[PDB]
């Protein structure tokens, strides 16, 4: 947990500064992203281990394929936004392991 929180610090600092690097080209996409929600591309499945007779709950990271934000920044910033959606998907995959 302590190691994974330090690694979370690294990936989150990278993704947060990458959001600023996207905002530099894309402008306020944040309002559009916040308003235009429907269904999650990433979801979590509860799974179990039974070591020493004790059931331990964990999560598996799972992915729905469909990108609800696919056309965002098509005209401008879509290069940095494509890096950004990957960086926050990598942040989520680490956070589901941390959870």
């Amino acid at each position: 947990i302590i190691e994974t929180k330090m690694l979370m610090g690294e990936v989150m600092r990278e993704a947060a500064f990458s959001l600023a690097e996207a905002k530099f080209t894309a402008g306020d996409f944040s309002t559009t992203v916040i308003q235009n929600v429907n269904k999650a591309q990433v979801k979590i499945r509860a799974k179990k281990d039974n070591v020493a007779g004790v059931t331990l709950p964990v999560f598996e990271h799972y992915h729905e394929g469909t990108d609800s934000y696919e056309l965002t920044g098509l005209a401008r910033g879509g290069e940095q936004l494509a890096k950004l959606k990957r960086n926050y998907a990598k942040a989520v995959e680490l956070l589901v392991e941390l959870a």
Binding site: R13, F17, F24, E70, L71, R76
Partner: protein, 348 residues
């Protein structure tokens, strides 16, 4: 020809906005800004340039979000104090600048109604350079179809909707296809308008708008490949103004991978240089960054002719770039990620 009469109506504002161009951060100001280590030092540097006192009487725990809002407040007040003094030819032209921001507001309004959100929730989020003159749509806020009718009544954008969009299309289109079809009509109409203001406006302004059309065709193309957009959807979204219109747009509608987009860019030495100037590797300037540098090269060069409207568009796009730059430098300083701080775009 135009020199004789242009200063009759616009010569004050031509002088005012050139005054406001002297009010920009030089390359030396950015090279001073990046030295320092906290948002309080950004305040002390901006206190010394033409931005003096802009951040007095504000919360002592500064944030980069305050810097963004205050730079927008400066930019909008400078623009309103010109638009309020401009006569009909320029005033229509300045309204074509505001129409770009109005498109990015009206799309939020429609998006909000499609998700049952009240327009009063989005009013504070709308760009102040795209602010509405008539509020009946804002006051009603009931349904997407009601808003469509209220936009046609209230909003200068009404003609762009009538050229491209029914209310039934707004129930079925992706909001980013909507924004782009509006921007197509906006550019084609504004380019026509600039050619009706023929001579030194068109001769300095059309090089910018033709680049906006060419840049959109490139960037929309290279971004579409990872998406559900068809060849026909790319063709429908491209602006018809730029040098690519005779065939470049057709070849980009045929394209499906980045190599074919470069093969279009290879025909025009400017676009050949923009692509060959960016591999988009780690620590490299990206392809879109090279376009943002060239958009600035054009908008600087539009100041080289004393008797035209090109300065007002160029001023706005350069103050927008200056707001992009100051925020990016403020982020690098506040977040301590100084490694990319040189990625602002120099202006003059």
């Amino acid at each position: 020809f135009p020199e004789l009469y242009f200063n009759v109506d616009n010569g004050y504002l031509e002088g005012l906005v050139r005054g406001l161009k002297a009010g920009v951060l030089s390359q030396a100001d950015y090279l001073n800004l990046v030295q320092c280590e906290t948002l309080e030092d950004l305040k002390l540097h901006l206190q010394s340039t033409d931005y003096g006192n802009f951040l007095a009487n504000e919360a002592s725990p500064l944030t980069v979000s305050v810097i963004d809002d205050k730079l927008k407040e400066k930019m909008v007040v400078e623009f309103r104090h010109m638009r309020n003094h401009a006569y009909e030819p320029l005033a229509s032209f300045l309204d074509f600048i505001t129409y770009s921001y109005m498109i990015d507001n009206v799309i939020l309004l429609i998006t909000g109604t499609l998700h049952q959100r009240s327009i009063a929730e989005l009013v504070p989020k709308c760009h102040p350079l795209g602010s509405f003159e008539q509020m009946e749509a804002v006051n009603i806020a009931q349904t997407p179809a009601e808003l469509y009718n209220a936009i046609l009544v209230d909003t200068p954008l009404a003609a762009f909707f009538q050229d491209c969009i029914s209310e039934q299309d707004l129930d079925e289109m992706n909001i980013e296809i909507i924004r782009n079809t509006l921007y197509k009509a906006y550019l084609e109409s504004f380019y026509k308008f600039c050619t009706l203001l023929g001579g030194t406006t068109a001769d300095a302004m059309c090089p910018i708008l033709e680049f906006e059309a060419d840049r959109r065709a490139f960037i929309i193309t290279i971004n579409s490949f990872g998406t559900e957009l068809s060849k026909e959807d790319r063709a429908k979204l491209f602006p018809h103004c730029g040098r690519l219109y005779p065939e470049g747009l057709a070849q980009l509608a045929r394209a499906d991978d980045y190599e074919q987009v470069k093969n279009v860019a290879d025909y025009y030495p400017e676009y050949k240089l923009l692509f060959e100037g960016a591999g988009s590797n780690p620590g490299d300037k990206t392809l879109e960054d090279r376009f943002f540098e060239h958009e600035v090269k054009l908008n600087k060069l539009a100041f080289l002719n004393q008797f035209h409207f090109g300065v007002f568009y160029a001023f706005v796009k350069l103050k927008e770039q200056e707001c992009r730059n100051i925020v990016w430098i403020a982020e690098c300083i506040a977040q301590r990620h100084r490694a990319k701080i040189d990625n602002y775009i120099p202006i003059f």
